[PDB]
Design a protein around this ligand. Sequence first.
Ligand SMILES: *[C@@H](C)[C@H]1/C(=C/c2[nH]c(/C=C3N=C(/C=C4\NC(=O)C(CC)=C4C)C(C)=C\3CCC(=O)O)c(CCC(=O)O)c2C)NC(=O)[C@@H]1C
Ligand SMILES: *[C@@H](C)[C@H]1/C(=C/c2[nH]c(/C=C3N=C(/C=C4\NC(=O)C(CC)=C4C)C(C)=C\3CCC(=O)O)c(CCC(=O)O)c2C)NC(=O)[C@@H]1C
Ligand SMILES: *[C@H](C)[C@H]1/C(=C/c2[nH]c(/C=C3N=C(/C=C4\NC(=O)C(CC)=C4C)C(C)=C\3CCC(=O)O)c(CCC(=O)O)c2C)NC(=O)[C@@H]1C
Ligand SMILES: *[C@H](C)[C@H]1/C(=C/c2[nH]c(/C=C3N=C(/C=C4\NC(=O)C(CC)=C4C)C(C)=C\3CCC(=O)O)c(CCC(=O)O)c2C)NC(=O)[C@@H]1C
Ligand SMILES: *[C@H](C)[C@H]1/C(=C/c2[nH]c(/C=C3N=C(/C=C4\NC(=O)C(CC)=C4C)C(C)=C\3CCC(=O)O)c(CCC(=O)O)c2C)NC(=O)[C@@H]1C
Ligand SMILES: *[C@H](C)[C@H]1/C(=C/c2[nH]c(/C=C3N=C(/C=C4\NC(=O)C(CC)=C4C)C(C)=C\3CCC(=O)O)c(CCC(=O)O)c2C)NC(=O)[C@@H]1C
Ligand SMILES: *[C@H](C)[C@H]1/C(=C/c2[nH]c(/C=C3N=C(/C=C4\NC(=O)C(CC)=C4C)C(C)=C\3CCC(=O)O)c(CCC(=O)O)c2C)NC(=O)[C@@H]1C
Ligand SMILES: *[C@H](C)[C@H]1/C(=C/c2[nH]c(/C=C3N=C(/C=C4\NC(=O)C(CC)=C4C)C(C)=C\3CCC(=O)O)c(CCC(=O)O)c2C)NC(=O)[C@@H]1C
Ligand SMILES: *[C@H](C)[C@H]1/C(=C/c2[nH]c(/C=C3N=C(/C=C4\NC(=O)C(CC)=C4C)C(C)=C\3CCC(=O)O)c(CCC(=O)O)c2C)NC(=O)[C@@H]1C
Ligand SMILES: *[C@H](C)[C@H]1/C(=C/c2[nH]c(/C=C3N=C(/C=C4\NC(=O)C(CC)=C4C)C(C)=C\3CCC(=O)O)c(CCC(=O)O)c2C)NC(=O)[C@@H]1C
Ligand SMILES: *[C@H](C)[C@H]1/C(=C/c2[nH]c(/C=C3N=C(/C=C4\NC(=O)C(CC)=C4C)C(C)=C\3CCC(=O)O)c(CCC(=O)O)c2C)NC(=O)[C@@H]1C
Lengths: 161, 161, 161, 169, 160, 160, 160, 298, 49, 67
Amino acid sequence: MQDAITAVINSADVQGKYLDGAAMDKLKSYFASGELRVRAASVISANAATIVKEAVAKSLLYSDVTRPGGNMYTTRRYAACIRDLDYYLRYATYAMLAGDASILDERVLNGLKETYNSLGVPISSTVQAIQAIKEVTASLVGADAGKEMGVYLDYICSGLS
Amino acid sequence: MQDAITAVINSADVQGKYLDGAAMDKLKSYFASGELRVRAASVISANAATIVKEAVAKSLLYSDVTRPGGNMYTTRRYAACIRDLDYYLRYATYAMLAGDASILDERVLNGLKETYNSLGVPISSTVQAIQAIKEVTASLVGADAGKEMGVYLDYICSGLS
Amino acid sequence: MQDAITAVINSADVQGKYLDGAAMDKLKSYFASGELRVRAASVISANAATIVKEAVAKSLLYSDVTRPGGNMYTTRRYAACIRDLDYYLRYATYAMLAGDASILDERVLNGLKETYNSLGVPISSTVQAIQAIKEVTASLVGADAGKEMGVYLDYICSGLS
Amino acid sequence: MRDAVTTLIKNYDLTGRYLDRNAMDELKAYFESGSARIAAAAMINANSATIVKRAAAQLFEEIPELIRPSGNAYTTRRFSACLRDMDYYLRYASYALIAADNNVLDERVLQGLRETYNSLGVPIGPTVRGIQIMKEMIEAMAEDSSLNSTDFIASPFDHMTRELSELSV
Amino acid sequence: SIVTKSIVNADAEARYLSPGELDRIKAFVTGGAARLRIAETLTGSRETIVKQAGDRLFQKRPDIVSPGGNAYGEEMTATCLRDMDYYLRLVTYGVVSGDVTPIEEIGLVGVREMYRSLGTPIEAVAQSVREMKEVASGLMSSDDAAEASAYFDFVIGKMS
Amino acid sequence: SIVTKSIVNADAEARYLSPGELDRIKAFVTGGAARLRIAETLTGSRETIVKQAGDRLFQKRPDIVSPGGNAYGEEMTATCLRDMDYYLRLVTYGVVSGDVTPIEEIGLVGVREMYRSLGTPIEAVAQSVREMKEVASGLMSSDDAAEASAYFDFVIGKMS
Amino acid sequence: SIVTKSIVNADAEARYLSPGELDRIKAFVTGGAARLRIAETLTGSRETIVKQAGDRLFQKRPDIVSPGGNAYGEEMTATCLRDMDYYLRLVTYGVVSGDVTPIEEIGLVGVREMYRSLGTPIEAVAQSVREMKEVASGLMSSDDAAEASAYFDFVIGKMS
Amino acid sequence: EMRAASADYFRNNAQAKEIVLQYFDILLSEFKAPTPANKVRQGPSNDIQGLELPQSYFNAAAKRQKYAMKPGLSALEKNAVIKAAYRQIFERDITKAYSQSISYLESQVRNGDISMKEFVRRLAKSPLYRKQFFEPFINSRALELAFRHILGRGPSSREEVQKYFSIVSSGGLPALVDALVDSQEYADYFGEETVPYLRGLGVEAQECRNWGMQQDLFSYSAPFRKVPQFITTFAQYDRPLPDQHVYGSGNDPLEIQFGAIFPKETRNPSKRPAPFNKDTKRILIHRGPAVNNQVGNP
Amino acid sequence: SVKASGGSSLARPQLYQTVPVSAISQAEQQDRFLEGSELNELTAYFQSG
Amino acid sequence: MRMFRITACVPSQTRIRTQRELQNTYFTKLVPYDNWFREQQRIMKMGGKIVKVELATGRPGTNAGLA
Ligand SMILES: *[C@@H](C)[C@H]1/C(=C/c2[nH]c(/C=C3N=C(/C=C4\NC(=O)C(CC)=C4C)C(C)=C\3CCC(=O)O)c(CCC(=O)O)c2C)NC(=O)[C@@H]1C
Ligand SMILES: *[C@@H](C)[C@H]1/C(=C/c2[nH]c(/C=C3N=C(/C=C4\NC(=O)C(CC)=C4C)C(C)=C\3CCC(=O)O)c(CCC(=O)O)c2C)NC(=O)[C@@H]1C
Ligand SMILES: *[C@H](C)[C@H]1/C(=C/c2[nH]c(/C=C3N=C(/C=C4\NC(=O)C(CC)=C4C)C(C)=C\3CCC(=O)O)c(CCC(=O)O)c2C)NC(=O)[C@@H]1C
Ligand SMILES: *[C@H](C)[C@H]1/C(=C/c2[nH]c(/C=C3N=C(/C=C4\NC(=O)C(CC)=C4C)C(C)=C\3CCC(=O)O)c(CCC(=O)O)c2C)NC(=O)[C@@H]1C
Ligand SMILES: *[C@H](C)[C@H]1/C(=C/c2[nH]c(/C=C3N=C(/C=C4\NC(=O)C(CC)=C4C)C(C)=C\3CCC(=O)O)c(CCC(=O)O)c2C)NC(=O)[C@@H]1C
Ligand SMILES: *[C@H](C)[C@H]1/C(=C/c2[nH]c(/C=C3N=C(/C=C4\NC(=O)C(CC)=C4C)C(C)=C\3CCC(=O)O)c(CCC(=O)O)c2C)NC(=O)[C@@H]1C
Ligand SMILES: *[C@H](C)[C@H]1/C(=C/c2[nH]c(/C=C3N=C(/C=C4\NC(=O)C(CC)=C4C)C(C)=C\3CCC(=O)O)c(CCC(=O)O)c2C)NC(=O)[C@@H]1C
Ligand SMILES: *[C@H](C)[C@H]1/C(=C/c2[nH]c(/C=C3N=C(/C=C4\NC(=O)C(CC)=C4C)C(C)=C\3CCC(=O)O)c(CCC(=O)O)c2C)NC(=O)[C@@H]1C
Ligand SMILES: *[C@H](C)[C@H]1/C(=C/c2[nH]c(/C=C3N=C(/C=C4\NC(=O)C(CC)=C4C)C(C)=C\3CCC(=O)O)c(CCC(=O)O)c2C)NC(=O)[C@@H]1C
Ligand SMILES: *[C@H](C)[C@H]1/C(=C/c2[nH]c(/C=C3N=C(/C=C4\NC(=O)C(CC)=C4C)C(C)=C\3CCC(=O)O)c(CCC(=O)O)c2C)NC(=O)[C@@H]1C
Ligand SMILES: *[C@H](C)[C@H]1/C(=C/c2[nH]c(/C=C3N=C(/C=C4\NC(=O)C(CC)=C4C)C(C)=C\3CCC(=O)O)c(CCC(=O)O)c2C)NC(=O)[C@@H]1C
């Protein structure tokens, strides 16, 4: 994986050039937004259960998947789904603190899409749950942190798609 | 056993060499610290029983060890625990005077853990007792003599553990 | 393992009281020494290989230990002794930063005596090497930081003895 | 583990004997007791969690210091661990009641109890006191219920007491 | 023991005994009367069972008792009959316990290695146990004969 | 990087970032201004730093530039100076990242065997990194140069 | 040796040695006279070999004995000669054993770490071993020189 | 009310009061949270008992750092994973301390040709491990060490020790390695991408039958106690009290003409504690006629 | 009681986590000196102490 | 040494009860032919589905030179 700083360093190093003005001001922006990202990550970690609960309530409760026949019906399947959503939230928080989206591909987008295809998991419902997580986290953290979190959430949903 | 002087002498003898400058320096250091050790030994010998008494009182009185069913419930078991504490105090004082921990291994630690494991003796409880013995002896003996005594008592505790 | 913070908290809790009059004093002393201890740890980490090199030069090198028949004779045995010295330095740093040698007790002293007694490592030579390490670190970090690390290094030496 | 039938079989095989009249009599006694054994096991399964909770709620009043400072159940973490040990005691006692032998009790409960509890600093007296409290609750509930035979229930808990209890005399 | 198996299976999941395991235990307890009847008949008839099985085996497989065979000689034949008595005793143990665990634990672990070391045809040993099965099943009702046939067939399978 | 290490530890421990980790991340972000100023000074003085380090290294270890060494004529000296500039740029990247991770990732692993294959003495390259360190420390302020030295000595020890 | 290696493999597989190992052991045992003879040759020439190899190595590499070199100084140079004698003795051990396992276990495991801690150039050590191999080949016949050079080049490659 | 009281009383600065606010919020959230489900360590087979542990115990016990060799891991974390695997399989960092390594297998694990499970399987049967933890040991002690190296634990049962001794007897080190890796417990606890870890006191539920055994096994001094501490204690549980001094096996001197030769408690650890109560007379073989023993002939 | 014993040795479960304990534990588990991240943790925590 | 290239997904059955960190149950593996039977049987007993398998190393029908 990498971050904003690691990515800019790699971009400079591939051409073998020192940090120019563009790298300098990108690092300035990363350091300026570091406080915002730390605050958002702290809030998310403090209220981690709340986002999962609210997104599940507004996304998949009283739905076909919760009905018998879908992958969300059984209690074990529900627990697996909520745990998967919680790991998705944790890795999204990791990506937001990092400033780079490589972490999700490193640990999340490696084989989750094809493994859900193997297990028959509803990918569209997964994307909907991720989107509901997007609104929940945006409401909890704020627009500034909300968009930053939603960037990686959309990255995860696109990778699943 | 062996004191610090014995250790220096043994090292020089095993190398087949006369006492060089470094050995003289270490002997001078031990001679410098000797009066301190004698004072601490005199204090502890004068107050041998008392320190044991407050060690038990701060550590083991009115506790599960002294309740019925503990290893220190019966009067005979209390006497055995007191004898253990008196051994540990006496041999820590001996090690303090000698400046060496060889005596504890030779006499106490060489079979004491297997002894307590065969007996069922609570090594966590005895560690707590000796740890309290640390401060109880330190109060009477001072700060630096207290540090030395705590070193030897930590030796006993680590051997027990 | 435990540090000064948790030792203070455990003592206060077992006594059933808050941190009233002396626990906070010890904690504030710990915090006051903390930044200097962190700097000392950084210096030790930077110069770890150099410290071991100088210690081996001072004590072990050109001795019967290194000569054939000694426990530091073969290349593998030499490397093992060097790695042991590195372990000593690293765990001394951990103990210095923690403010308690509980880490040394649980991770180093737990079976150190058994391992050296079984293998045949010279305890006297090891203690000489550790004393040389302490002297070199004190020279390289300052008398105050030298003593602060030397208390734990001498704790390890005493446990070895 | 060995139940009563298996322990009898092993005992006879030790001497290399065929099952004699005494063996048949012991087997008949166990097989007739099996109905009450299953009944008591069903009842304890029904009231398990309540039994352990009540036993703790009596033991912490008998020896109050296990919840006060320096006590061994002081935290909620320690409290939950203590209740977990109590639940383990009840479950293995149920297994021993159904098996009519305490060897399943020994192989999975007692064989290192003092070592583990000494290492963790747990008292070894209050634990057996809570064990006896559980046994009293179990036998009182069985007597209240329609259990014709209930004598065997004291055997597993009393064996636990005798094994894990310090030899006072 | 079926009780042993059920308790062990429950403990592996760390729960109290399931209702299914309790039902199995109750069924085993109820059938204990028939178990004792079968075992008692087997032990009472142990002499005739062993003798008739040995006669049938020594008629069907004269090679093992002819010179050059493992059981050749009076002492070797007596030892073969003693092995048959051991396995009948193990079958009684299994009958009482309601399962084959005692049979496996005592006389079915490493039996192939033991008899290879002794030089015995394990197929001949299995034939002997099969004849013991036939003789014993002739001495009881249809239900109990089939019930003991389970232990006999288990020994046969483990020996071949 | 500090944030990379935080994410790695969080993944290994299976949990979010603790208050201590968040506080250290915040402190690292605050010190990012000073570390970026360090990088600015180093990149401003890169050319003179590399030139002085090269000439000092040649003076101290003539064997590299003398016959028998890796420095012959102009092309070998140019290659050695290119490697020196690469190491300086890696040190700058480490300074900007606040961690030795970028240096190790770009070049710190396998440098020993790479120089062994190339015939370039690893002790000599470590020495040259050393003189780069002293020249940079002299160029910059003493207190501010401590942070740069904290990575220069790291690279020197790794190559030692 | 080959005997130890084959026995270790047989033990790891929990089996007796195969004939394909036994015949190899027989051939190794039979062909021991030449290995022994090379051993006495090297041991007799140890002092001359060490002296000539050290002289050639120091002539080729002046920085080793130059000021600031690892072997600079009287005791340092004597210790480098001692290391050369060590490796010559290990090579003799390997030649006698018909295997490189004694050399690897005695003075080849952790050699990189040891000499790195000492500051010595492992490449220079390998060059010294190469000079020793050249001298030994000069003092040995064509076949014996090649056979000893096998172990010598193994040592050199392991060093670098 | 407590949170509000603390906030109003202090109210100094956000840098000094946001900590109090955060900690009271954590307190309220934890209090509102329902009781977590206890972790359950299933019995691997019929031999071992199932276990459970509260999910509050597994929140303070310094949880192990888990390393998984994902395919895309950069060089730094891949190196960290390889080092963790080396430490798990060798009790230390043999590559760092001696430069001993197998780059042949390292490359395959790095690119993902063989994942973590097959890496462990090949490494354990490699000669590097065979010279360090099988060659210098009895089969029993080697099996006990192999459990912690591969299974993150020790032997759990007399039956487990018996079965794996039979396996190692039949197929040796490779057979034991295969039986350990291709087992339900291994794939359950580590899957195919997780390097094995030591499931200690806080990692999971510890059965109260191998407490001292696994406590001694996990420490780095394990490869020096050459006497098997697992099979011996597992047999001693089923057997009665042994021929042994009351205070321990190390307390019996050798029966030689002279010299107080004692087993040293720290050198080659062989302590065999037994529960000897007070009134436990020993059986001593009389030198003279057996009828002259004062036990029966006072 | 029991006819054998594994042997009682002291166990040290961590009651709770502090920042110094966490950093020291990570470094010890990874077999490393306290690197820049752990050192920053320690320094910031000591300052806020 | 002949070896199989197998692609398989083996979802956990006790993650919920044990509370352990998740792992990608989908993986491509190079498994020795000797261990392949045991590995496949373990996979089938675990409940996962093996999606692809092939003899990556070795020639089909080889009579000698398996190792
Ligand atoms: C020429 C050989 C190179 C060289 C040598 C050199 N070595 C040392 C010091 C030591 N060398 C060893 C090595 C070994 N001892 C063993 O037992 C084994 C296997 C048999 C080996 C490989 C050791 C242990 C030492 C330490 C000294 C001691 O014997 O106690 C030095 C001196 C280092 C110093 O600073 O003291 C030197 C000079 N130096 C070169 O430059 C050549 C490449
Ligand atoms: C100088 C240090 C002395 C010396 C060292 C020496 N040690 C060993 C072997 C071992 N040392 C340890 C000790 C530890 N390992 C740990 O992980 C910890 C805490 C982090 C400690 C204290 C161990 C476990 C071993 C054996 C296993 C291993 O490889 O680590 C040797 C090897 C001896 C041999 O012949 O095998 C040596 C030489 N030797 C001296 O002479 C110096 C006084
Ligand atoms: C009634 C006894 C308790 C109660 C009910 C209650 N339930 C929900 C929500 C859900 N309940 C379920 C049920 C199941 N999930 C499973 O996996 C199974 C086992 C196979 C069952 C029976 C589910 C799926 C949901 C969520 C999805 C859905 O609604 O279908 C609520 C909703 C709470 C809220 O805030 O929305 C309630 C109230 N309430 C009580 O007080 C009783 C203790
Ligand atoms: C009363 C007649 C006398 C007296 C009593 C007294 N005792 C203590 C403290 C302890 N007494 C005991 C004794 C026993 N504990 C046992 O388990 C047994 C057998 C069942 C005996 C005999 C113990 C162990 C203690 C220690 C405290 C504890 O057990 O927790 C005190 C207080 C001592 C103190 O300073 O704490 C007193 C006052 N005092 C008299 O004057 C009477 C003659
Ligand atoms: C109700 C309004 C108040 C209350 C009453 C209450 N508590 C108990 C029992 C216990 N309370 C505790 C407390 C703690 N455990 C911890 O780890 C912490 C530290 C943060 C605390 C404060 C414990 C350990 C127990 C169990 C032991 C005991 O009996 O005390 C009861 C009794 C319940 C019963 O009889 O079963 C009651 C009535 N607790 C509150 O928090 C309220 C302020
Ligand atoms: C409750 C009645 C008493 C009490 C309990 C207590 N126990 C522990 C910790 C452990 N208890 C056990 C016991 C067992 N494990 C088993 O497998 C078996 C049989 C199935 C038994 C009996 C073990 C092994 C532990 C440690 C490991 C674990 O729990 O997984 C504690 C924790 C103490 C602490 O400080 O952590 C406590 C509190 N405490 C009391 O005060 C009661 C008298
Ligand atoms: C050198 C001629 C070319 C080159 C090399 C290069 N390779 C890699 C990475 C890997 N190479 C392999 C190959 C093998 N590993 C083996 O074990 C074997 C069979 C025994 C082979 C053929 C592998 C597996 C890798 C992946 C990493 C690993 O360590 O295993 C790299 C780096 C790739 C990276 O992404 O970092 C490089 C540079 N580069 C060239 O330009 C040459 C044409
Ligand atoms: C046969 C000549 C005698 C005999 C043997 C016997 N042994 C056992 C059980 C075991 N034997 C061993 C021995 C070893 N393990 C090793 O690692 C080594 C060296 C590689 C040896 C020699 C072990 C460990 C066991 C335990 C086996 C198990 O699974 O527990 C038994 C069975 C004991 C029992 O069933 O309890 C027997 C019978 N017995 C005799 O009477 C012969 C004189
Ligand atoms: C001499 C050839 C070698 C040698 C001898 C040596 N032995 C000791 C010490 C002891 N030797 C014994 C031996 C025996 N005790 C018996 O009962 C018998 C059976 C007939 C024998 C052979 C004992 C018990 C000791 C212990 C000390 C004692 O005398 O009581 C030493 C000294 C040990 C010490 O540190 O005191 C020595 C030197 N040493 C060599 O190097 C020779 C190869
Ligand atoms: C007789 C049924 C079997 C038998 C017996 C036999 N025993 C011995 C010798 C001893 N027997 C004992 C036993 C005990 N001593 C005790 O104090 C107790 C417990 C209270 C017991 C069980 C002892 C200790 C001895 C040694 C002499 C002594 O008593 O001090 C022998 C003689 C052995 C010899 O070589 O002299 C014999 C023959 N032998 C059989 O064949 C029977 C199965
Ligand atoms: C919830 C949004 C959807 C859902 C979930 C669901 N998942 C599974 C099974 C698994 N999920 C995972 C999770 C991961 N694998 C990874 O590699 C990563 C990162 C490392 C994660 C988070 C895994 C591993 C499994 C397999 C089992 C295991 O726990 O290891 C199921 C179970 C399917 C089944 O019937 O077996 C379910 C239900 N289901 C939905 O309907 C949602 C759209």
